[PDB]
Amino acid sequence: SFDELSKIIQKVFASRKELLEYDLQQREAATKSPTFTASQYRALSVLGCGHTSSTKCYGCASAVTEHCITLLRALATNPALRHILVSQGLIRELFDYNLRRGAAAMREEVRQLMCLLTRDNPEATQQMNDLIIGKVSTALKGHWANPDLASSLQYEMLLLTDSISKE
């Protein structure tokens, strides 16, 4: 159903573009019987029409989150930028949201970024350790009445392993 919908939507878009181009040409012909700069021509014409994503799109938001993770990983290699980022409160945001969401590669990249953010900062390391210990203790308190609590700590323990493995 999605494939048929996409085909029909593309056909409709092509038809709309052709119709609007013809209307613009006819209007210009009627008017010829105003200078535009190079950027204004692109803005007005049909050239800048079909490269914008929908506002409520899951895939596009996922892609933007991937780009944000990549850019933040690049930025964190500067110690001053690392300090500013950890002062923004990025560690808790990455812990609550991006640890468990996305492809496996993205999850490992988020783990690497979280490890890098605490490379030589005792306060950031203490904060991350507090988050991990709190989650593990809260899960282990009710593990006995619900085993999924004990079996849904793999990412916290993986984060601990990754942080320790980097001397």
Interface with Zn ion by CB under 5 A: which residues? 53, 57, 59-60
Helix pair 154-165, 104-117: axis angle to 10 deg: 50
- The one among 34, 56, 120, 144 contacting a second copy by CB under 8 A: 144
Residue 48 corresponds to which amino acid? G
What single-letter DSSP state applies at residue 48? G
Q: Which stretch binds a second copy (CB under 8 A): 40-48, 111-119, 146-154, 157-165?
A: 146-154
Partner whose binding site includes residue 148, from Zn ion, a second copy, none (CB under 5 to 8 Å by kind): a second copy
Q: Which of a second copy, Zn ion, none is residue 59 near (CB under 5 to 8 Å by kind)?
A: Zn ion
Only segment of 25-33, 64-72, 74-82, 89-97 that touches a second copy (CB under 8 A): 89-97
Q: Which residue lies nearer to Zn ion by CB, 2 or 144?
A: 2
What's the alpha-carbon Rg for the chain, to the nearest Å? 26
Residue by residue, DSSP assigns the chain as -HHHHHHHHHHHHHHHHHHHHHHHHHHHHHHH-----HHHHHHHSGGGSS----SS-HHHHHHHHHHHHHHHHHHTTSHHHHHHHHHHTHHHHIIIIISSSS-HHHHHHHHHHHHHHTSS-HHHHHHHHHHHHHHHHHHHHSTTT-HHHHHS-HHHHHHHHHHHH--
Residues 17-56, one symbol each (x = binds a second copy by CB under 8 A, - = not), give ----------------------------------------
Nearer to Zn ion, 33 or 52 (CB): 52
x/- track of binding to a second copy for residues 95-134 (CB under 8 A) = xxx--x----------------------------------
Residues that bind a second copy in the complex, under the rule CB under 8 A: 95-97, 100, 138, 142, 144-146, 148, 152
